[PDB]
Amino acid sequence: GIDHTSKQHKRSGHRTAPKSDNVYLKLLVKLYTFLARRTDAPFNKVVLKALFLSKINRPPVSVSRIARALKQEGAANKTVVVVGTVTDDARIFEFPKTTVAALRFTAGARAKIVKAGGECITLDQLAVRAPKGQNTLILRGPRNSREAVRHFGMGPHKGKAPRILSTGRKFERARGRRRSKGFKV
Amino acid sequence: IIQAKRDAKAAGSYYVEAQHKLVFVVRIKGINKIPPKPRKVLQLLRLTRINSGTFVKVTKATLELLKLIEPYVAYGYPSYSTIRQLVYKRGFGKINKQRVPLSDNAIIEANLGKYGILSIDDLIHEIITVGPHFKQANNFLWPFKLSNPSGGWGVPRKFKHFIQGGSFGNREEFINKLVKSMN
Amino acid sequence: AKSKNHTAHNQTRKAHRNGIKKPKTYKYPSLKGVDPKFRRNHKHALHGTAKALAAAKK
Amino acid sequence: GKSHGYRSRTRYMFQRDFRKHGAVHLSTYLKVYKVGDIVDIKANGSIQKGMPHKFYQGKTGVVYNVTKSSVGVIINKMVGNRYLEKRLNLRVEHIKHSKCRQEFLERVKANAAKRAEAKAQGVAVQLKRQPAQPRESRIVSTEGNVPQTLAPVPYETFI
Amino acid sequence: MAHFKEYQVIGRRLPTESVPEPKLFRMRIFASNEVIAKSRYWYFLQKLHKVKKASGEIVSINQINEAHPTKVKNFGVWVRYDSRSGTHNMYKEIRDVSRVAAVETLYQDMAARHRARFRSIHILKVAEIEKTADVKRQYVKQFLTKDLKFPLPHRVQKSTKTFSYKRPSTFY
RNA sequence: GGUUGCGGCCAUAUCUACCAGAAAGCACCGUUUCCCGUCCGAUCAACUGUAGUUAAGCUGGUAAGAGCCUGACCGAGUAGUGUAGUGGGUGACCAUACGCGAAACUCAGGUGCUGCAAUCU
RNA sequence: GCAGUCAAGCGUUCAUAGCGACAUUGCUUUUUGAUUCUUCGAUGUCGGCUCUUCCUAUCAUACCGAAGCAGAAUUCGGUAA
RNA sequence: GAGAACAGAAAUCUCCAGUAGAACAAAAGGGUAAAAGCCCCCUUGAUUUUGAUUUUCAGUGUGAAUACAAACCAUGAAAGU
RNA sequence: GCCCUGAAAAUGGAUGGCGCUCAAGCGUGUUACCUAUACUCUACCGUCAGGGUUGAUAUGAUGCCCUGACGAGUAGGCAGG
RNA sequence: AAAUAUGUAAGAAGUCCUUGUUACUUAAUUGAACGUGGACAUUUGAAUGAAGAGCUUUUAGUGGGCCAUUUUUGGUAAGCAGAACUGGCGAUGCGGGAUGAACCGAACGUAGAGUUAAGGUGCCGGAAUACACGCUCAUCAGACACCACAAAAGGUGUUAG
RNA sequence: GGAAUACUGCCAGCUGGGACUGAGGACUGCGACGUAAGUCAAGGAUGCUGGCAUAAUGGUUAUAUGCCGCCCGUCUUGAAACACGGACCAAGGAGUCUAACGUCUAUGCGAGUGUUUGGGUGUAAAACCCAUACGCGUAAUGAAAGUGAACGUAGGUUGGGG
RNA sequence: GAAAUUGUUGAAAGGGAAGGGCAUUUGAUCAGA
Ligand SMILES: [K+]
Ligand SMILES: [Mg+2]
Ligand SMILES: [Mg+2]
Ligand SMILES: [Mg+2]
Ligand SMILES: [Mg+2]
Ligand SMILES: [Mg+2]
Ligand SMILES: [Mg+2]
Ligand SMILES: [Mg+2]
Ligand SMILES: [Mg+2]
Ligand SMILES: [Mg+2]
Ligand SMILES: [Mg+2]
Ligand SMILES: [Mg+2]
Ligand SMILES: [Mg+2]
Ligand SMILES: [Mg+2]
Ligand SMILES: [Mg+2]
Ligand SMILES: [Mg+2]
Ligand SMILES: [Mg+2]
Ligand SMILES: [Mg+2]
Ligand SMILES: [Mg+2]
Ligand SMILES: [Mg+2]
Ligand SMILES: [Mg+2]
Ligand SMILES: [Mg+2]
Ligand SMILES: [Mg+2]
Ligand SMILES: [Mg+2]
Ligand SMILES: [Mg+2]
Ligand SMILES: [Mg+2]
Ligand SMILES: [Mg+2]
Ligand SMILES: [Mg+2]
Ligand SMILES: [Mg+2]
Ligand SMILES: [Mg+2]
Ligand SMILES: [Mg+2]
Ligand SMILES: [Mg+2]
Ligand SMILES: [Mg+2]
Ligand SMILES: [Mg+2]
Ligand SMILES: [Mg+2]
Ligand SMILES: [Mg+2]
Ligand SMILES: [Mg+2]
Ligand SMILES: [Mg+2]
Ligand SMILES: [Mg+2]
Ligand SMILES: [Mg+2]
Numbered sequence A: 001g002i003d004h005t006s007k008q009h010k011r012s013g014h015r016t017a018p019k020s021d022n023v024y025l026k027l028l029v030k031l032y033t034f035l036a037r038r039t040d041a042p043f044n045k046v047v048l049k050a051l052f053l054s055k056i057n058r059p060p061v062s063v064s065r066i067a068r069a070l071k072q073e074g075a076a077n078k079t080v081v082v083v084g085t086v087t088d089d090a091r092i093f094e095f096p097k098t099t100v101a102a103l104r105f106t107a108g109a110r111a112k113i114v115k116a117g118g119e120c121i122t123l124d125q126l127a128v129r130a131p132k133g134q135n136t137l138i139l140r141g142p143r144n145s146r147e148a149v150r151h152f153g154m155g156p157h158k159g160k161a162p163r164i165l166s167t168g169r170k171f172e173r174a175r176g177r178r179r180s181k182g183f184k185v
Numbered sequence B: 001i002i003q004a005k006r007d008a009k010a011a012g013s014y015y016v017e018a019q020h021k022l023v024f025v026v027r028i029k030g031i032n033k034i035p036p037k038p039r040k041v042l043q044l045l046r047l048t049r050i051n052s053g054t055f056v057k058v059t060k061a062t063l064e065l066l067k068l069i070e071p072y073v074a075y076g077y078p079s080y081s082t083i084r085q086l087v088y089k090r091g092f093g094k095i096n097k098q099r100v101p102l103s104d105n106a107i108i109e110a111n112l113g114k115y116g117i118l119s120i121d122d123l124i125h126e127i128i129t130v131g132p133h134f135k136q137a138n139n140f141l142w143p144f145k146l147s148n149p150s151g152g153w154g155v156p157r158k159f160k161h162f163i164q165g166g167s168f169g170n171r172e173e174f175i176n177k178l179v180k181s182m183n
Numbered sequence C: 001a002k003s004k005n006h007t008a009h010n011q012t013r014k015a016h017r018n019g020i021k022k023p024k025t026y027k028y029p030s031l032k033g034v035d036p037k038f039r040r041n042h043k044h045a046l047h048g049t050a051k052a053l054a055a056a057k058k
Numbered sequence D: 001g002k003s004h005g006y007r008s009r010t011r012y013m014f015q016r017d018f019r020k021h022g023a024v025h026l027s028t029y030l031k032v033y034k035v036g037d038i039v040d041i042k043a044n045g046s047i048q049k050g051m052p053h054k055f056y057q058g059k060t061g062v063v064y065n066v067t068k069s070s071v072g073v074i075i076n077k078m079v080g081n082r083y084l085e086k087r088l089n090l091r092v093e094h095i096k097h098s099k100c101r102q103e104f105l106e107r108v109k110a111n112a113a114k115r116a117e118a119k120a121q122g123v124a125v126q127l128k129r130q131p132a133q134p135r136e137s138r139i140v141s142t143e144g145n146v147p148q149t150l151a152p153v154p155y156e157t158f159i
Numbered sequence E: 001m002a003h004f005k006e007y008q009v010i011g012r013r014l015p016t017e018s019v020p021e022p023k024l025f026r027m028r029i030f031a032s033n034e035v036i037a038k039s040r041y042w043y044f045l046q047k048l049h050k051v052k053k054a055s056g057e058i059v060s061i062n063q064i065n066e067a068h069p070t071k072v073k074n075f076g077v078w079v080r081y082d083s084r085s086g087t088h089n090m091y092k093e094i095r096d097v098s099r100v101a102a103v104e105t106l107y108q109d110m111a112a113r114h115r116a117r118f119r120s121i122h123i124l125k126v127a128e129i130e131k132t133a134d135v136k137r138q139y140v141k142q143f144l145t146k147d148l149k150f151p152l153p154h155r156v157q158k159s160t161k162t163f164s165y166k167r168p169s170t171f172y
Numbered sequence F: 001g002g003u004u005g006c007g008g009c010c011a012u013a014u015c016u017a018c019c020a021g022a023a024a025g026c027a028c029c030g031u032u033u034c035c036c037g038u039c040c041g042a043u044c045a046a047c048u049g050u051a052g053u054u055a056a057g058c059u060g061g062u063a064a065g066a067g068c069c070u071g072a073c074c075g076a077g078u079a080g081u082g083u084a085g086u087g088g089g090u091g092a093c094c095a096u097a098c099g100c101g102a103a104a105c106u107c108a109g110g111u112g113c114u115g116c117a118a119u120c121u
Numbered sequence G: 001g002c003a004g005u006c007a008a009g010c011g012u013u014c015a016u017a018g019c020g021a022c023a024u025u026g027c028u029u030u031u032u033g034a035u036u037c038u039u040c041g042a043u044g045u046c047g048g049c050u051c052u053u054c055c056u057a058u059c060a061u062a063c064c065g066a067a068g069c070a071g072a073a074u075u076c077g078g079u080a081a
Numbered sequence H: 001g002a003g004a005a006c007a008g009a010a011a012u013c014u015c016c017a018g019u020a021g022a023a024c025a026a027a028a029g030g031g032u033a034a035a036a037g038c039c040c041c042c043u044u045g046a047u048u049u050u051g052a053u054u055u056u057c058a059g060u061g062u063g064a065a066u067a068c069a070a071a072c073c074a075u076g077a078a079a080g081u
Numbered sequence I: 001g002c003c004c005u006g007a008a009a010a011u012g013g014a015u016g017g018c019g020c021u022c023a024a025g026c027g028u029g030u031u032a033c034c035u036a037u038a039c040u041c042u043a044c045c046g047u048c049a050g051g052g053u054u055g056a057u058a059u060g061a062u063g064c065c066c067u068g069a070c071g072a073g074u075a076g077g078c079a080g081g
Numbered sequence J: 001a002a003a004u005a006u007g008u009a010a011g012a013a014g015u016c017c018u019u020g021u022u023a024c025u026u027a028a029u030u031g032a033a034c035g036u037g038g039a040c041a042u043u044u045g046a047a048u049g050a051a052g053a054g055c056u057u058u059u060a061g062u063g064g065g066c067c068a069u070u071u072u073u074g075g076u077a078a079g080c081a082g083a084a085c086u087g088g089c090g091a092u093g094c095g096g097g098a099u100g101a102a103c104c105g106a107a108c109g110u111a112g113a114g115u116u117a118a119g120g121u122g123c124c125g126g127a128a129u130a131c132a133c134g135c136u137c138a139u140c141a142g143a144c145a146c147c148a149c150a151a152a153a154g155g156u157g158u159u160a161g
Numbered sequence K: 001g002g003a004a005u006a007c008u009g010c011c012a013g014c015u016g017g018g019a020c021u022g023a024g025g026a027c028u029g030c031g032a033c034g035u036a037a038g039u040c041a042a043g044g045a046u047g048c049u050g051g052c053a054u055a056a057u058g059g060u061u062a063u064a065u066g067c068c069g070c071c072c073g074u075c076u077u078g079a080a081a082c083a084c085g086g087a088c089c090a091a092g093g094a095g096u097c098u099a100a101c102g103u104c105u106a107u108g109c110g111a112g113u114g115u116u117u118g119g120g121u122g123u124a125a126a127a128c129c130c131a132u133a134c135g136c137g138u139a140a141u142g143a144a145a146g147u148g149a150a151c152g153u154a155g156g157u158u159g160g161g162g
Numbered sequence L: 001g002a003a004a005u006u007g008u009u010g011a012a013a014g015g016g017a018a019g020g021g022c023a024u025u026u027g028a029u030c031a032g033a
Helices: A025-037 A042-051 A063-071 A106-117 A122-128 B002-010 B036-044 B058-067 B080-090 B105-115 B119-128 B134-140 B175-182 C011-017 C038-057 D026-032 D102-121 E032-049 E101-114
Strands: A077-089 A099-105 A119-121 A137-138 B014-016 B022-027 B052-057 B073-076 B092-097 B098-101 D038-041 D058-065 D068-077 D082-091 D095-096 D138-140 E003-009 E025-031 E056-064 E073-082 E088-097 E121-128
Touching: A025 A042, A025 A122, A042 A077, A042 A137, A063 A077, A063 A099, A063 D026, A077 A106, A077 A122, A099 A106, A099 A122, A106 A119, A106 B134, A119 A122, B014 B036, B022 B080, B022 B175, B036 B058, B052 B058, B052 B134, B073 B175, B080 B119, B092 B105, B092 B134, B105 B119, B175 C038, B175 E032, D038 D068, D058 D082, D102 E101, E003 E032, E003 E101, E025 E032, E025 E101, E032 E056, E073 E101, E088 E101, E101 E121
Parallel strands: A077 A099, A077 A137, A099 A119
Antiparallel strands: B014 D138, B022 B052, B022 B073, B092 B098, D038 D058, D038 D095, D058 D068, D068 D082, E003 E025, E003 E056, E073 E088, E073 E121
């Protein structure tokens, strides 16, 4: 017998491969597995990890987010890397010329980038151009802006978006939501 | 030390030897029915299995731990011979959270060389003389997995104090006989 | 048919299974209970400092 | 029925420290508390306003708010299997400056001085505290101290 | 506890700034090993003086060997023991060639006759009775007569085999 | 060093009984027109500092003083208590082992220290 | 319910032949409680009749010890189911 | 306690002692002495606004309470409350 | 201290049984010895973890391989079949 | 007025220094809080450990418990009834206590060898009818904790005081 | 006075007997011995020899022997229970589908998304194609009238992978 | 043309159930090389 100080046979709790059966995603994972093993590039390791992420853990990155990241000082000529989808954003009117590497480009995002004069490349093209992640800028979309997230941690005095099907007057607004009816929250 | 004792006796004095700086502790109790404070102390001394043993540097902070775990351990003052045989036969290093036998001085140098410990004898020296890097060397040493004593425990019942004819507590110099039988 | 009334038996074991977690101290604690007069002046002082440091960028 | 009022079981807790009843001395009110100060909570039973609950008697917290006659103290209370932040509004008669950090503060000052002297003189620091160490060897003399032999005494009653 | 040795144990009641060189108290302890000897020293010292192992130190511990281990002595032994219902002092006499042998005999005899375990017994004193006719116990005096001889009737020989073919004899 | 005003700690400062106190201060003390308050100028108010006194207050000293304060290998490593045993004992309870460790008691010492301002033989 | 210990007293005098206060130690489970462990997909609920066996804290019978046993009668006790 | 007509053991007056041995609506505990008690004077903070906090606690409600803020007031010479 | 009296219950029966008396009992001491799914070492299964290896004849990178640790289980969850 | 238990602290989010904001605060740049700038890495400031730390979502079952040591209430008491802490059983086999949910030992993948735990070694039964000093004779002897009970009072039984 | 011996401890002193194991599978390492060639007990067994070549080993099965082994399921704190169901066997026999949903995941597209109400078409309930709407989302908040999201590089600070 | 259940034949065992686990003996039977 052993007095165990920790749970036995505990899985790491991190993905070691994509749940997806996408053969092309698996090819990208194989390439970046080789790169992360045999380059000692932290970029390669983080890209390999990001290739495993689920859909909610790869929120889309808009071209406006990319443009703000390029407005960062000294980052204007860096290749922007999004392990996920790059979406279009018409709220921005001045997109700069740049190289973006992404898993997927929306038609509109690709059109905007090409029109601004840059290029949209895949992650294997990124790997060939920058095997050590040279001159890269990894961008990630907003995870906690998901609609599901605003209902997390619901409770008294939390302000956390009750799970509700119909909204308006008569729908969870009277007793427990105002001092005039019992109490508030 | 021998000459100091002889000289004090010749001068009509008594040479009080320095208090022991090192103890070897062996958990002699199983893992069932242990109160939480002694259980936590045994975990913190890395004695999570019966007949698992570790070296402890003696301070007030660790003597108050030995006091708490007294009914579950047999401990005492290890000799050079005991330490040498323990490290040579059952010396394992904790390398990358893995238990690696100390079969070559290169292993010891690769993991403890930054502290000046280049070989198994350097490790043993850092253990027996509680050196500046005793904490690091002792922690690098995986807890020793001893067997049951080859000639038995010498007593009918292990779980009264050594003073009361049992096995636990401070058996100060007889820990060498016990550990040599268990090693 | 009477039953058991109360016991704290096993409750500390349950608590320590996922442990007694220390409350994750942060730099810049919240100003929830701070005196509102102090908070009003603090807002004005911080705004003034921000404006001064904005002009200080030369 | 059972009784759990606010001051239940406070009979001895909130008593006035025999032969120390009456008015609070002026140093209590002359102490100055700043946000961030560490304070021990000990309720004065003669000041019924701004009194802490009995749970906080003997707890040490950090001042987060300073008002006319009181301070706000941050306590970490064990609730269930985790700690919750509690904010008490205590009049200054129920708190005092904690000395739980003064040893550390003078140690920091002395460590700065020792480091300065070390970097002005040579190379040795030894700035960490150490537990009490095993005693070194010593020679005990018998000059005027010849060992006196004791024996266990026989039993007697002396009643 | 076991086959006994005798130790001198000298302890100090550790020096302070006010009282350097404390009074160096010594005891003669019968114990099977030095660990038990020092434990017993602290036990009796805590019974006698304001000291404990945490506030004192063992200055010396030395085995005392019998001066004349091959001469038969008569020993007077004063003990104090706890019975089931009280505490009693007793004086006994033991014939043996060493103090440790006499003390082993005494512990055996106390356990046999009064069911007094080691923990319940304090050896107040062990002393050689130098002059016979100061021996005051008959069970020792009967062995101090001149030209003492006695037979050993009914000798029982231990057989090394299960079966014997002889119907043995108890002659001696 | 004395004294006053304001104090800090709040008896080592309190209490009991005596003795002493120079200078200044403080005080008791003298007076009732005014402001003011009383059954009562006793308290409180006001006026004089003049008529008087250290009697008292006050301060200090004394006492095998009471109390209080401090210390102790004083009692006592006692009582108690954390931990241990397939220890004792029918039990009540107890002993031992590894630790922590009182109170009463006894003895010894002590009896306000001190900040700010002003003042004084 | 049954049985002990002590022995202030009763018993003409005498604590204990026979008793025995104030106390106190027990045993038994043929009382009644206390509890709610078993049984509510069911163990047939009074008593008697009948019949066997067991216990002994013995009523009788056998043999005994004690007596405030002259005899007789009786009482206390022992081995005894 | 020592005193004063009726007046005694208890009525009112006087002094001395008096650490609270009284009183504070009520149960009990805590607290309180130039007061929190007794008496007197003035009053309406037992008001307005909406938050935070403590106890019970799920860190929900309710009750009760704490410290502020923004007003308007009461009292006092005032600090304050 | 041990032993004895005190010491009475019901089917025949329990130091577990036999039986044991300088014990095969009681107290105490010393050794040797016996044996758990525990401890030590080794193999094998699985799980978990850390790594190596897309440089070729390479079809099994979910592959092959190296290293270390671990394995109780109702209700229950999940996984691979 | 303990012991046990218990709050806090033991650094870079630290210590100190210079001076900017404000409608707060002060008689007053007085301070308060927040800032700008500057110095201080071997022990960055006790020990030991750290199959890492932190974070989130979502759901199962459960919401009759019981037992042991110790603390402890009601009760004459209970294998009774009710609390405290821990350890267990439930949910657990295995070796031991003959037997037994909870006691002792020890927790369990499949095997081999070695050694042990608790408990034992006359025979059942693996293992000394071992060694040693005493004690005990019972016409109801005694024979290992939990545990399967015995007391007061007595005995020139016998032993030692 | 000079020794010895016991006891305890140490040796990187020598050596005999017994048992279990032989995992791995080119080399690579650390060493030892040797001046060096090379050898070795140094990152896991080889060498030599015999018999048999089949029921001999082994498997299966029945039996015997030693030791162990209560009847499952269920409710329960607790079941082998003097608690319940079960004489036996076969076949049948119990978390399903639907509407609307929460979390998570996969996929398509993405500020949009959803062809399938319907129309077109067809090798005819399939597949293929499609307009206008409509649903959800892109805006919130208030009881409502109503109003409705950049001071700033869409902010400052602390941390933050890359 | 299953099982329960049954007849016959053959084999085996059988002192108040039977059945089961580990191990081997014996009998029968059999694969691999
Ligand atoms: K029933
Ligand atoms: Mg295991
Ligand atoms: Mg052996
Ligand atoms: Mg044993
Ligand atoms: Mg319940
Ligand atoms: Mg108090
Ligand atoms: Mg006057
Ligand atoms: Mg006046
Ligand atoms: Mg005078
Ligand atoms: Mg005095
Ligand atoms: Mg135990
Ligand atoms: Mg019950
Ligand atoms: Mg039935
Ligand atoms: Mg029936
Ligand atoms: Mg019937
Ligand atoms: Mg009879
Ligand atoms: Mg007043
Ligand atoms: Mg209420
Ligand atoms: Mg008897
Ligand atoms: Mg036996
Ligand atoms: Mg014996
Ligand atoms: Mg892996
Ligand atoms: Mg499992
Ligand atoms: Mg259950
Ligand atoms: Mg268990
Ligand atoms: Mg039993
Ligand atoms: Mg095994
Ligand atoms: Mg045998
Ligand atoms: Mg008796
Ligand atoms: Mg030797
Ligand atoms: Mg091989
Ligand atoms: Mg065969
Ligand atoms: Mg059986
Ligand atoms: Mg069952
Ligand atoms: Mg039954
Ligand atoms: Mg039923
Ligand atoms: Mg039926
Ligand atoms: Mg079927
Ligand atoms: Mg047919
Ligand atoms: Mg058939």
